[PDB]
């Protein structure tokens, strides 16, 4: 229903800055927390990506679409595969310095079973 | 005229009902809901009668003509409104006040005059058209 209007970001630093220029994330007024997770290569933890994914998918239900870079999604693969709902939607889009690779994409794995 | 149309509503309604049970519907065309809805009314006003309540089973042949006349008219406006655009939920809700009155008009029998065509029904007809306009726009 119409109660979800936020876009959360899991993306690399430069990509998250861009998305934010367009304006799609924010610091919520009901919880004081971003709707974005700023990530850097080789300088942030594998655990933190996990926490963010859960938080936006299951402990937040006001996120409409969660964008996630395939490369970052890969780190936390178990958790991406395991969220199977459509509310919120989970959408892997190609990461930075990488074109479309079908082997990192959680949704395409679901589609394989049955047609 | 009405008679064929009374039969026509009840017939399509029957068929639609097996399709709701069998497939276990996830949607309906906006017209078909109207057919089902108009049939429910037929059930109350004619089919539900009690032979020891004489307020709930008595009508002269003309009174019967006027009540059925009202129904067949409601179907006729409703089919046009979807066609000109308007959602079913819009159709049902905006028609509203006259829909209650026709439902509840089965609690009447001649007692406002020795007359077999009443002001009760004649008033409803003009108000029903007025309701239709609202639904459509």
């Amino acid at each position: 229903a119409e109660k979800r209007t936020l876009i959360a970001v899991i993306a690399d630093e430069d990509t998250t800055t861009g998305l934010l220029l367009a304006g799609i994330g924010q610091i919520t007024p009901e919880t004081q927390e971003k709707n974005f997770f700023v990530y850097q290569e080789g300088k942030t933890t594998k655990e933190e990506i996990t926490d963010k994914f859960n938080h936006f998918t299951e402990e937040r239900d006001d996120i409409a679409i969660l964008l996630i870079n395939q490369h970052i999604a890969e780190n936390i693969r178990a958790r991406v595969d395991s969220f199977t709902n459509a509310f919120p939607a989970i959408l892997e889009i190609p990461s930075k310095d990488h074109p479309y690779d079908p082997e990192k994409d959680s949704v395409l794995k679901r589609v394989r079973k049955l047609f | 005229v009405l008679r064929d149309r009374m039969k026509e509503i009840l017939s399509n309604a029957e068929e639609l009902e097996q399709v709701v049970q069998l497939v276990g519907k996830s949607a309906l065309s906006d017209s078909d809901k109207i057919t089902l809805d108009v049939a429910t009314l037929i059930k109350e006003d004619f089919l539900q009668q009690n032979g020891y309540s004489t307020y709930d089973a008595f009508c002269p042949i003309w009174k019967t003509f006027d009540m059925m006349r009202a129904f067949i008219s409601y179907h006729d406006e409703a089919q046009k409104a979807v066609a000109n655009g308007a959602n079913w939920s819009k159709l049902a809700d905006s028609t509203g006040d006259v829909k209650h009155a026709v439902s509840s008009s089965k609690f009447f029998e001649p007692s406002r005059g020795e007359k077999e065509v009443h002001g009760e029904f004649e008033k409803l007809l003009s108000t029903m058209q007025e309701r239709f306009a609202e639904s459509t726009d």
Partner: protein
């Protein structure tokens, strides 16, 4: 087990129900599979389109940051406390089932951000936002299709289950019940005729002989 009298009336309408329902479920599956093939092809395309739109924009953002001489992304994160580009949920009927769709609307909470003033280098940052606002919008409209696609996959499974269920269970259960009751019912009737006849032969004989 079951009535031996007038199971035929309820059972007859079930049997017809079942074969009629089955045919119909097949058309609903055929429609669901029909759309499914089409969206799978459209979605793979849409992944590359989004990849590119983000990448070309993303690079321009990288260039703007190194050329001016400072890292902007920190300042941008601090300024933002509303989301400009938001979405409105709507249901669109594709096949029997309603899927969820998003239509973006742009709300004027914020126009740019209050951080540009970096003299000559500041024009590079202002322009960078203009190119990105347009890129993000391509992603969002494309992103809507992704949502429906996950929704279709969940529905098809309920639908494949039903088409099997009717054929394999219901239809032979109706057949066995109707025929077995039919056969018992006719038997009661036939033996009676034989019993009436048997006593009447006794009667006829007795009358006849002197």
């Amino acid at each position: 087990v079951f009535p031996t009298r007038m199971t035929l009336g309820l059972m007859k309408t079930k049997l017809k129900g079942a074969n009629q329902g089955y045919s119909l479920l097949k058309r609903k599956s055929e429609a669901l599979t029909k759309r499914f093939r089409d969206i799978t092809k459209r979605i793979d395309d849409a992944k590359q389109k989004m990849g590119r739109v983000m990448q070309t924009a993303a690079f321009s953002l990288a260039e703007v940051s190194y050329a001016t001489g400072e890292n902007i992304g920190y300042q941008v994160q601090e300024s933002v406390s509303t989301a400009r580009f938001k979405v409105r949920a709507r249901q669109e009927n594709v096949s029997g089932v309603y899927l969820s769709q998003f239509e973006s609307y742009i709300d004027p909470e914020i126009n740019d951000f209050r951080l540009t003033g970096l003299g000559r280098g500041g024009q590079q940052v202002q322009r960078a936002k203009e190119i990105y606002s347009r890129a993000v919008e391509t992603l969002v409209e494309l992103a809507s299709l992704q949502t429906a696609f996950i929704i279709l996959d969940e529905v098809i499974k309920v639908t494949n289950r039903r088409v099997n269920a009717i054929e394999h269970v219901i239809i032979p259960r109706t057949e066995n019940t109707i025929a077995y009751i039919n056969s018992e019912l006719d038997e009661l009737d036939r033996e009676e005729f034989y019993r009436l006849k048997k006593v009447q032969e006794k009667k006829q004989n007795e009358t006849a002989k002197l």
